[PDB]
């Protein structure tokens, strides 16, 4: 949730796990100001709903 | 820091305004035409 504290102005975020599944996507929905998103090796296996 | 989506080519009409004086988002600047941004950065 710390990223939600910076989501008011952050426009680029690039999180690249080494295989860990990004199981939850609740905080990512708070990224209104985001214009660039990179989900690298997040093991989602499906199109994320937060995007 | 604003909610701009596409920057119109009219930004290239400002002779005194250049890229250094242009404070825009990278995506905002990329919405400018290639000729406009090339004039913005250099003499093309």
**Strand segments (E) across chain A:** 12-16, 36-40
Query: How many residues does the structure list for chain A?
Result: 51
Mutate to test the interface with B, among A11, A13, A37 (most CBs of B within 10 A): A11
Which phi-psi region, left, alpha or beta, contains residue B40 (left: φ > 0; alpha: ψ -120 to 50)?
alpha
**CA of B27: which chain A residue's CA is closest?**
A35
Q: Determine, for residues A35 and B27 on separate chains, whether the beta-carbon distance falls below 8 Å.
A: yes
Q: How far is CA A31 from CA A23, A25, A50, B25, in A?
A: 17, 11, 9, 17
Q: Check the CA dihedral B40-B41-B43-B44 and report its sign.
A: negative
HSE value, Cβ hemisphere, 13 Å, CA-based, for B20: 2
A36: its two tokens? 């660039």
Q: Which residues of B touch A9 (CB under 8 A)?
A: 1
User: What resolution (Å)?
Assistant: 3.7
Distance CA B12, CA A37 (A): 29
Experimental method: cryo-EM
Q: Which residues of A touch B31 (CB under 8 A)?
A: none
Nearest to B11 by CA among A40, B25, A35: B25
């Amino acid at each position: 949730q710390a990223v939600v504290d910076v989501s008011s102005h952050l426009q680029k975020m690039c999180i690249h796990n080494d295989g860990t599944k990004l199981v939850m996507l609740n905080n990512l929905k708070k990224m209104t100001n985001l214009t660039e998103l990179e989900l690298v090796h997040c093991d989602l296996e499906r199109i994320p709903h937060a995007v | 820091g604003n909610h701009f989506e596409i920057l119109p080519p009219e930004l290239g009409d400002c002779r005194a305004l250049k890229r250094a004086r242009l404070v825009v988002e990278d995506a905002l600047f990329e919405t400018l035409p290639s000729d406009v941004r090339e004039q913005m950065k250099a003499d093309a």
